[PDB]
Design an enzyme around this catalytic site. Sequence first.
Site, PDB file in Angstrom:
ATOM      1  N   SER A 130       5.427   7.707 -15.937  1.00 28.25           N
ATOM      2  CA  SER A 130       6.026   6.606 -15.192  1.00 28.25           C
ATOM      3  C   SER A 130       7.514   6.495 -15.412  1.00 28.25           C
ATOM      4  CB  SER A 130       5.455   5.312 -15.738  1.00 28.25           C
ATOM      5  OG  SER A 130       5.914   4.147 -15.066  1.00 28.25           O
ATOM      6  N   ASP A 175      -0.126   7.920  -5.389  1.00 27.13           N
ATOM      7  CA  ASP A 175       0.583   7.006  -6.272  1.00 27.13           C
ATOM      8  C   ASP A 175       1.229   5.888  -5.452  1.00 27.13           C
ATOM      9  OD1 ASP A 175       2.127   5.705  -8.239  1.00 27.13           O
ATOM     10  OD2 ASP A 175       2.725   7.609  -9.236  1.00 27.13           O
ATOM     11  N   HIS A 207      -1.308   6.789  -9.916  1.00 25.55           N
ATOM     12  CA  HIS A 207      -0.366   6.662 -11.002  1.00 25.55           C
ATOM     13  C   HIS A 207      -1.068   6.741 -12.354  1.00 25.55           C
ATOM     14  CE1 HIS A 207       3.637   5.714 -12.129  1.00 25.55           C
ATOM     15  NE2 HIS A 207       3.205   4.827 -13.037  1.00 25.55           N
TER      16      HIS A 207
END
Length: 257
Positions: A130, A175, A207
């Site tokens: 991330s 995502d 994600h």
Amino acid sequence: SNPYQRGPNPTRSALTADGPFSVATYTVSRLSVSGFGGGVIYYPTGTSYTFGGIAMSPGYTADASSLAWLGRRLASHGFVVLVINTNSRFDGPDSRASQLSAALNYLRTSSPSAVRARLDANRLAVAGHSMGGGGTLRIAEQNPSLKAAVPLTPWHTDKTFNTSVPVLIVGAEADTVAPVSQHAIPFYQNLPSTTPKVYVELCNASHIAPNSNNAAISVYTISWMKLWVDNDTRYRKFLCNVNDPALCDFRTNNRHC
Ligand SMILES: [Cl-]
Ligand SMILES: [Cl-]
Ligand SMILES: [Cl-]
Ligand code: NA
């Protein structure tokens, strides 16, 4: 040839499970370190070799435990791997870069002697999920002595990193936290043309794909680290002439082949 070579000739199958080295773990307490939130060191044991080091950041609101599988996976293939906790779970990407930087210094200078005995601090790399992947890009630009950077489902508001460090980016097709069209793909595109770079996109992945055992993440992360941290060209074959049903996109400037 190649003093950094470790482990047997790799097969794809071997890269989807823990590797040939026994793994020890060391808890870095939050309070023992300034500069980051502690974390966990995964590192080889039962061996007299030294290995490259990797500092790895979890993502927005996440704990180091979220990447425990990958810290162990990498270490088991022959790396000293510090997965950090952040000062605050809410830290953004550039803060996470600074903490990666602190964690690298810690590994070289202040980690336990059993850890230092297994590390070649001349050969260091970064990775992160991330926001931690956005920190990975930032630090790769701030510190070009790093050997490699692997941003996983990365997020950052800044889109251009002028780094010479080899970058492999993992995007996730579905995502919605860090859409690949705004994040992962611009990052790949905006890296220097002369920097070795690869973009792989996992079909049907969200994600949270990096937060659990994932065969494609395993293969590409291990391969990029081996290739550049260890100069280990035995791993080029996983990264060249790629034809992988697990991926819904693939891009490279093919400098690494
Ligand atoms: Cl030893
Ligand atoms: Cl920040
Ligand atoms: Cl130093
Ligand atoms: Na904040």
